[PDB]
A paper describes a structure:
Our crystal structure, determined to 2.25 Å resolution, reveals that SenB is a type B glycosyltransferase, displaying the prototypical fold with two globular Rossmann-like domains and a catalytic interdomain cleft. Despite a lack of significant sequence homology to any structurally characterized proteins, the overall SenB architecture displays the canonical glycosyltransferase type B (GT-B) fold, consisting of two globular Rossmann-fold domains. Each domain comprises a parallel β-sheet linked to six short α-helices. While the β-sheet of the N-terminal domain (NTD) is comparatively extended to six strands in length, the C-terminal domain (CTD) terminates in a long α-helix, which extends across the entire molecule. The orientation of the two domains forms an electropositive interdomain cleft known to house the active site in other nucleotide sugar-binding glycosyltransferases. Further inspection reveals a second electropositive pocket, ∼20 Å away, that is linked to the putative active site by a positively charged groove. Activity assays confirmed that SenB does not require a divalent metal for activity, and no density was observed for a bound ion. The apparent disorder of SenB’s interdomain cleft in the absence of a substrate (regions of missing electron density indicated by dashed lines) is analogous to that observed for substrate-free MshA, perhaps consistent with catalytically relevant conformational flexibility. To gain structural insights into substrate binding, we soaked SenB crystals with UDP or UDP-GlcNAc; however, this treatment dramatically reduced the crystal quality, in many cases causing rapid dissolution that precluded structural characterization. By contrast, efforts to obtain a SeP or thiophosphate-bound crystal structure of SenB simply yielded structures lacking ligand density, suggesting that in the absence of a nucleotide sugar, the phosphate group may not bind to the enzyme’s open conformation.
Residue numbers in the entry: 2 to 14, 19 to 88, 90 to 154, 159 to 184, 190 to 229, 234 to 287, 294 to 331
Amino acid sequence: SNPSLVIVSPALPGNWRTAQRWKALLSPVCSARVVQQWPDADASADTVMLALHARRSAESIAHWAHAHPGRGLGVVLTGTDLYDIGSDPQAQRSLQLAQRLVVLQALGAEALPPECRAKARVVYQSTSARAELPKSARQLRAVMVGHLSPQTLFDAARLLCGREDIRIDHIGDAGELARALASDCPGYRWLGALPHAQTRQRIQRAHVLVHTSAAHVIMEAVRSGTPVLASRVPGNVGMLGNDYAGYFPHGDAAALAALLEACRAGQGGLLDSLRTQCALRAPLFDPRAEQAALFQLLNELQPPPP
Ligand code: NA
């Protein structure tokens, strides 16, 4: 067992969702609580800290390292901090103060300074599974979930302007650039902001998910039996694997269009290969696995009684 764990998520009312999911997976072995800032009024009881984002939580992190020198500090690199730690002094200070660093995919520790890697640990994110649905051989529907690399998808859709056999469904809140692409191109559609249940059903129902960004969406696709076409950036490669066959160069719309065309051609195949490759990735995103990685991390951070 019963350590008192504090999760720092300084998000304004991504990281909140992770924080809540970690609290639920750790609640069986610890008294877990989420805060925006530490310390608070219940802070004298806390023994272990899991702070999300080396910069946004730096002030909590620094407060923890003063009250608990060499004890209980886990700092989670959520993305933009890892890819901040180049110039940000606070981000850098957070890396040095931590007893443990958490990266969320395999490749994270390569961006970490050399002296910070031994204390890094890989904890893949997790999501619930959806059943893999049968898919038509007569079209290829691609879904992209991403608040408005928007231009990369936009350019690929214009390079495919006449095709109605390749359909691109863009989900996300922004805008007129999207509405224009929707009027001009039969196969592009901007559905705007959609509820979370509808977004996951469309991903489950899509032949493929396209991610051009430089993470939860990729897990939701993989765990719903939907392959992914993704930009070759470390965050994505860490999720899908160094030998994944569905990568496109970041900012290369022609390469993205070619990849959709190749998926379409093998219908009736690259798409079948991508499906097989994603099914081998899916067990990395099992809640059981994330929970187990968290248990071990908590046993490592747990400080001996003062
Ligand atoms: Na508990």
